[PDB]
Amino acid sequence: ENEDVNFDHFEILRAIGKGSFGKVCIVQKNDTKKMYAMKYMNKQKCVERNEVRNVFKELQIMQGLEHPFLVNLWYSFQDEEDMFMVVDLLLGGDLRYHLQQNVHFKEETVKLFICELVMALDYLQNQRIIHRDMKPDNILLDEHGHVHITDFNIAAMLPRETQITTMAGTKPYMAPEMFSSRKGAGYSFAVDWWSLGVTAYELLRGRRPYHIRSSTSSKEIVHTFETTVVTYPSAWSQEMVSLLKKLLEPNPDQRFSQLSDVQNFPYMNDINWDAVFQKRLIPGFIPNKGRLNCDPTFELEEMILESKPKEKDMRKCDSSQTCLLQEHLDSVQKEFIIFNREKVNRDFNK
């Protein structure tokens, strides 16, 4: 069938995360009974806050990506109030949650995390994509402990022989080259390998390798990178330490920034990369409690679980503010491009 998937094809279950433009929810598709994560984006808020172009860019990027260590897009659609993104549901939740439970991850587990994510990053680069927000909050586990990159909210397409200067990222994960105010400058894919490093170090240690905050001035940060020596606890293997160090090269040109740099790294001579890609190397034991749990809380929100939830056809328009809104909403409705991977899959076998 060539029928369009829309919001009525799903049943909405528990909310699992929050956004300035709407929630993330668990949904079940009615027909297949398959469960997904769905990101709401309020059209009005998006228009008022000039996010519409970013939402479209993200959808466009996600439509052209598929990889075992990404949280992949399956459907997009809209109704009158919202735009929707339906993507893989990762039942283990994010890594931040476990760090917040004071979990320290075993060296071997982190090695295997790096292997999986490095295949994702390399794939992103081959597709000309910088993610720009790699960090524990944005890396999700499946039920077997494999790790996956999500939240492409600030991901950018970088055309060949171009560079990017705009400051966008989470500051304690952002690479030194992102802060340099030298007029002849820029950054590239290598920044995602830096933040992978910061992320791996953080998983091993419990804390980040640099003290940087979201409030810290750019000048202090440049100073922090230039005058701090990262502490590498003696308990760690020289192999891991020397991996972390190639990810945390302040000079992007000397940093690992490619799948092959890691494939050829001695520490990694025991890795079967076909097995990694096929999800046959389980990283390791993962604590029972992840961010999805239904351990009872006093959250006023969602203790009301038992409850269940000819005016636009006039073409109304009142003031300049309300008329501009309508023009933009009209434009959203008309420009939005439905994506459906099932259909792309079916029409590949034809």
Global shape: globular
CATH class value of the largest domain: Mainly Alpha
Distance between the termini: 13 Å
CATH overall fold name of the largest domain: Transferase(Phosphotransferase), domain 1
Share of helix, binned: 25-40%
Class by SSE composition: alpha+beta
Please describe the biggest sheet, giving its number of strands, its sense, and whether it closes into a barrel. Answer: 6 strands, antiparallel
Strand order of the largest sheet: 1-2-3-5-4-11
The SSE order reads EEEHHEEEHHEEEEHHHHHHEH
CATH architecture of the largest domain: Orthogonal Bundle
The number of helices is 11
PDB class: transferase
Keywords: Structural Genomics, Structural Genomics Consortium, SGC, transferase
Assembly: monomeric
Entry title: Crystal structure of human serine/threonine-protein kinase 32A (YANK1)
Description:
There is one protein chain. The protein is built from eleven helices and eleven strands. The chain has about 350 residues and is of the alpha+beta class. The chain has two domains: about 130 residues, Phosphorylase Kinase, domain 1, CATH 3.30.200.20; about 220 residues, Transferase(Phosphotransferase) domain 1 (Transferase(Phosphotransferase), domain 1), CATH 1.10.510. A six-stranded antiparallel beta sheet has the order 1-2-3-5-4-11. The protein has a three-stranded antiparallel beta sheet with strand order 6-8-9. The longest helix is centred in the N-terminal third of the chain and has 20 residues. This is Serine/threonine-protein kinase 32A. One of its GO terms (molecular function) is protein serine kinase activity. Its main location: membrane. Belongs to the protein kinase superfamily. Ser/Thr protein kinase family.
